[PDB]
Structure formats: structure tokens, C-alpha cells
């Protein structure tokens, strides 16, 4: 921790005496003698467990639409918006999910 | 061929249409609000619960 | 003066001048393209084997 | 003190983050093992991931693990990844034709500044794109021929 | 289980040297390749860890198939760390019987003096090194490797009268290479590829090796 002395003002170190260790300093003449015990805990933050990412369960949070898809004839799908500027003027595009058992991605 | 104001206009029935979806979103997202106050919304995948 | 590819895409055909997504041509579209183009009722129908 | 938490005890230095990803199928269940970091030379000879079915997206790095031939396939897999995600079509050679540009002479050369003087050998075209007079005169000083072609 | 993890992990090496060693071109007969874990364990026991399977017996004569007075001589160093002395010894104790080829399994980092040493000198003895890390999958069949084949110069000279072109407008490969190093290649020297694909079928490429 952070300890000074009470006579200058300064830090003090813990250096080798004559026969055991003492809390000295190199600004005024001070030394304090060590006894039975000193002790400092500190509580370093843990890590936790990751998580799985990605599967159904996260794609339930979305909802979707009922529009069919010409690859396996499904009509359950996954419709998303999105914003795109095209050569001539703004236009709004839809992104498709198959929600299937090939289960494929298009943007038309 | 032409375009007028009647021909975007709302109708009689989609008035009310509307207005239920409206409550009844509002009144399912002024409890998740109270529910993250509590403790709640087990989140799946890995991420904030904000 | 130095060979870049021995043959351009690897049988060298135009990217432009192709039909289908990928394709020299579609067989299928010709067939009955030309299956009526060309009625030939007095010609008699033939077998697989021959 | 402040140095015990950064010595690693297991895993490699490399490697920052790793998720699981499920994929589904009609009903069969998948688990593939995505991380994020470089040294694929490490992962991939591991006991759990099979080193046989593994994908990078570094070229520097997949040239300098598999080679030079197969960095001209992970190249053209990227840039297609890139254009249907956008709603856009181009045609393979048109790709394939440019993977092998920079793969014909050496390594995998980008097409920078430095790598067009490695391609292309006429001062006159990199007159443009250098500056004041640093390669006109050391090209007087040299003394070195350019062919008009 | 660490000791387990290490007889798998040499098991598993030992398998694509002996691979290399059979699809380069020398006689390997195929009982040893596709050696099972319980015939494997019959040959070197598993205990103690660095007791009865030591590296002075991981050391095998490899035959040439084609020329039948050549044999290879391939082996692992015994402490992890490469010094100078230890392989000098080991290169003398080659050069001894009948043997110019040796290969070194390396297990642990390099020493850049012994690289310099070893490439200075190559008259008709000649040291290729292998780090153990990344000699634990075959590299030639992979995902998208291209089946690459060793020519002969008789076919060289066909192909350049083919197309009338020069060794120079070949294009060139490294010799540093993961498969060049491999197949073990030196400089003049074609290699085919085999490109398949899956609408029209497989292309064939010739490339050169510097
Ligand atoms: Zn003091
Ligand atoms: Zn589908």
C-alpha cells in the first residue's frame, strides 16, 4: 500500500537492519521495527465462463414472414430490411433466410 | 394514367388496425423495461443484457 | 513477354457472351426453342435405343 | 505482482477469443470452432481440431502455412464472399484472372507502390507517382535502359 | 495423460514422414504406413516418457524404389534445443556406412549458427531440417491443395517445344516453400498441377521451381 512518515512527509522502504528487517527511509532518520505480522489481500477479478454463440435459439429472436423460397419450396423464412444507395436513386432491399434444412442466404 | 391525393389516404378499417398493434407493442415493451429494473430477460448468447 | 496463364478462365470463353449464371449456353431452352420453330408431323417418332 | 496475471499458463499468446458456432441441418447437429488470431500453424496442429478441415482469412499467413498455390484459391473465396454480400454477381475468371497476376513471378504481391515497381520495370509511368526528383535522377545516375512497349 | 498426448503426438508425425517418405518415390511397404495405435504400441511401449521409446531408436533407414544402392537416412535429435557438436557427430555417424541424405526431425527451436553450418557445406552430403510443430498434418491433401507432381526433364523439353517458349517464362515457384520443401525439389525443375473443380472438370498447370 501507500505508507509515509509522520516526522517529514516521504515514503518509506523496507530495507535490512542488524539483525531483522525495518521500515526505513533516505529523507530523515526513521525506522520502524517489523512485527508479528503485516498483511495486505487483494482480490484480483476473476474470469467467468464463455458462452456458445450462434444456432436457432438466437435466430427465434428475430421474427420472420411467411414468403415462399424457390430453392426447396418453404414458406417459412427470414426477412430483414436494409438501406442501400443504387446508381440512379435511394432503394430499399430485402435480405432472405431460408429457414430450412439447406438453409441458404440471398439479397435481392 | 395519373395519381391524385385519394388514392393514398387511410381507411376506415385500417385505422383501428393499427392502433391495437400500436398498444399492444407499447404495453409489451413498458414490461421489459420494469423486468431489467427486477432482474430479468435470461439472455442465450453471450452479450449485455442492455 | 513473360506467360501469365496458360489459357484464360481454362477453356477460353468471353464472360460477356454466355447464357446462364455461368454457362455457354442452356441446352434445354434450345431443344424447345427449336421443337417448334421446326413442325414435322409426316416424320414419325423414334426410341431411345435407336 | 503486476506481471504474475500476464504470465500466460496455458494456450497460445496468439489467439485472443474463441466461440462455438451450431449449425443445423435437416437432423444432423454441428460444432465448428471459429477463433480469432494469426499463427494457424498452431491451432491447426492440435488433438481437438482436425487439421485437415480448417479455413484462414490472413493470405500472408495461409501462404506462409499451406503455400503460394493455395493462397490463389483462399484469395478468390474472399473477394466472392465480399460481392454476394452486397447483392452482385461477377464472373469467376474475371477474378480468377487477377488471383493469378499476383501469383505467376513470386509470392503474393499487393498492388501498392512498392509492389508495382516489383511488377512493372519504366520509370516513366512511376514518374507520376513518386515525387520531386528522387527516381529521375537516380535514373541518370544508374543509366539504365526503358523499353517503350 | 500428458504422456499419452506425446506418444499420439510422435505417432502421429511418425505418420507423415512415413507418408512423405512413400509418395516421394521410395519403396515403402504399406503395412508400416497404416500401422494401427495397438500394433504401434506393440513395437515401443508408451512408459516411461522419455525412457523406452527414446529418440537414439526413432531413427529409420528409408529404400529407394528406383535405384536399389541408395537408401536415406532420417532421424530425431535426442535433446530438444539443437547444438553444433550434436549433430556433427550424427551427420559423421551417417557419413560412416553407405548414407549422403539425412533428414533431422528438429523438436524445439533452431540455432542460426547451426543453419549457416549446415548450409555452407554441400558438396554431395546435403541436411534438411523438419520442425516437429508443423509436421503434424499432410499438407498435400489439405482442403484446396492442388495435386502437385514431380516431371522429368525429358517431358521439360516437350513442353517447351510445345508452347515454344523458355525455362524463364515458366513461371516460377519458391524453394522455401511448405510443398517445395516437401517434395524436396532443387532449382530447374518443373511440377504439374492438377486443379479440379466440379462444372467442367480438372485443368492442368505447369509451374518452375527456383
Ligand atoms: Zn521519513
Ligand atoms: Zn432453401
Same mark, same amino acid.
Given at each position: 500500500?501507500?505508507? *509515509? ?10 530495507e ?10 533516505? @529523507? ?10 503485516? @498483511? ?5 477479478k476473476?474470469?467467468?465462463?464463455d ?7 438466437a435466430?427465434?429472436?428475430?421474427d ?14 427470414? *426477412?430483414?430490411?436494409?438501406? @442501400? ?7 430499399? @432491399? ?15 | ?17 393499427? #392502433? ?5 407493442? #407499447?404495453?409489451?415493451?413498458?414490461? #421489459? ?18 | ?8 478462365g ?10 446462364? =449464371? ?12 427449336? =421443337? ?11 426410341? =431411345?435405343?435407336? | 505482482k ?41 491451432? !491447426? ?15 500472408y ?21 465480399? !460481392?454476394?454480400?452486397?447483392? !452482385?454477381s ?11 497476376? !499476383? ?19 519504366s ?17 541518370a ?9 | ?23 516421394? +518415390? ?43 544402392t ?21 551427420? $559423421? ?38 520442425? $516437429? ?55 530447374? $525443375? ?10 467442367? +472438370? ?9
Amino acid at each position: 500500500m501507500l505508507l *509515509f512518515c509522520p516526522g517529514c512527509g516521504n515514503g518509506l522502504i523496507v530495507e535490512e537492519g542488524q539483525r531483522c528487517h525495518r521500515f526505513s527511509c533516505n @529523507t530523515c532518520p526513521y525506522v520502524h521495527n517489523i512485527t508479528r505480522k503485516v @498483511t495486505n489481500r487483494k482480490y484480483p477479478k476473476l474470469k467467468e465462463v464463455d458462452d456458445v454463440l450462434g444456432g436457432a435459439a438466437a435466430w427465434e429472436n428475430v421474427d420472420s414472414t411467411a414468403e415462399s423460397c424457390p430453392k426447396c419450396e418453404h414458406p417459412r423464412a427470414y *426477412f430483414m430490411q436494409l438501406q @442501400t444507395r443504387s446508381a440512379d436513386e435511394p432503394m430499399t @432491399t430485402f435480405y432472405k433466410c431460408c429457414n430450412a434444412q439447406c438453409g441458404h442466404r440471398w439479397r435481392d | 394514367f395519373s395519381i391524385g391525393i385519394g388514392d393514398v389516404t387511410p381507411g376506415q378499417g385500417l385505422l383501428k388496425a393499427k #392502433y391495437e398493434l400500436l398498444n399492444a407493442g #407499447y404495453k409489451k415493451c413498458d414490461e #421489459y423495461i420494469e423486468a431489467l429494473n427486477t432482474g430479468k430477460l435470461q439472455q442465450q448468447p453471450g452479450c449485455t443484457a442492455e | 513477354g513473360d506467360i501469365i496463364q496458360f489459357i484464360y478462365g481454362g477453356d477460353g470463353l468471353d464472360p460477356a457472351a454466355m447464357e446462364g =449464371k455461368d454457362e455457354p449456353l442452356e441446352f434445354k431452352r434450345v431443344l424447345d426453342n427449336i =421443337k417448334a420453330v421446326f413442325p414435322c408431323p409426316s416424320e414419325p417418332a423414334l426410341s =431411345k435405343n435407336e | 505482482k503486476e506481471d504474475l496475471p500476464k504470465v500466460v499458463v496455458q494456450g497460445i499468446p496468439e489467439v485472443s477469443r474463441a466461440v462455438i458456432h451450431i449449425d443445423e441441418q435437416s437432423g444432423k447437429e454441428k460444432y465448428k470452432l471459429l477463433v480469432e488470431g494469426d499463427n494457424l500453424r498452431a491451432v !491447426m496442429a492440435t488433438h481437438g481440431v482436425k487439421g485437415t478441415r480448417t479455413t484462414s482469412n490472413n493470405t500472408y499467413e495461409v501462404e506462409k502455412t499451406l503455400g503460394i498455390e493455395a493462397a490463389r484459391t483462399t484469395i478468390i473465396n474472399e473477394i466472392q464472399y465480399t !460481392m454476394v454480400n452486397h447483392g !452482385m454477381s461477377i464472373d469467376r475468371r474475371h477474378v480468377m484472372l487477377l488471383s493469378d497476376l !499476383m501469383t505467376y513471378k513470386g509470392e503474393v504481391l499487393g498492388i501498392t507502390r512498392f509492389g508495382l515497381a516489383k511488377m512493372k520495370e519504366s520509370v516513366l509511368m512511376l514518374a507520376s507517382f513518386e515525387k520531386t526528383a528522387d527516381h529521375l535522377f537516380d535514373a541518370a545516375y544508374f543509366g539504365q535502359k526503358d523499353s517503350v512497349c | 495423460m500428458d504422456d499419452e498426448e506425446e506418444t499420439y503426438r510422435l505417432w502421429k508425425i511418425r505418420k507423415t514422414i512415413m507418408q512423405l517418405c512413400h509418395d516421394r +518415390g521410395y519403396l515403402v511397404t504399406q503395412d508400416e504406413l497404416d500401422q494401427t495405435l495397438e500394433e504401434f504400441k506393440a513395437q515401443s511401449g508408451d512408459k516411461p516418457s522419455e525412457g523406452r521409446p527414446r529418440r537414439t531408436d526413432l531413427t529409420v533407414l528409408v529404400a529407394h524404389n528406383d535405384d536399389p544402392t541408395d537408401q536415406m537416412f532420417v532421424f530425431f535429435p535426442e535433446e530438444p534445443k539443437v547444438g553444433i557438436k550434436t549433430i556433427k557427430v550424427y551427420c $559423421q555417424r551417417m557419413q560412416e556406412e553407405n548414407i549422403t541424405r539425412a533428414l533431422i526431425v528438429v523438436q524445439q527451436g533452431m540455432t542460426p549458427s547451426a543453419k549457416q553450418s549446415l548450409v555452407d557445406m554441400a558438396p554431395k552430403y546435403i541436411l534438411e531440417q523438419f520442425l $516437429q510443430q508443423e509436421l503434424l498434418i499432410n499438407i498435400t491433401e489439405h482442403e484446396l491443395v492442388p495435386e502437385h507432381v514431380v516431371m522429368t526433364k525429358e517431358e521439360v523439353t516437350e513442353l517447351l517445344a510445345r508452347y515454344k517458349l523458355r525455362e524463364n517464362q515458366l513461371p516460377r515457384i519458391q524453394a522455401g516453400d511448405p510443398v517445395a520443401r516437401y517434395f524436396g525439389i532443387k532449382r530447374g $525443375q518443373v511440377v504439374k498441377i492438377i486443379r479440379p473443380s466440379e462444372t467442367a +472438370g480438372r485443368y492442368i498447370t505447369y509451374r518452375l521451381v527456383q
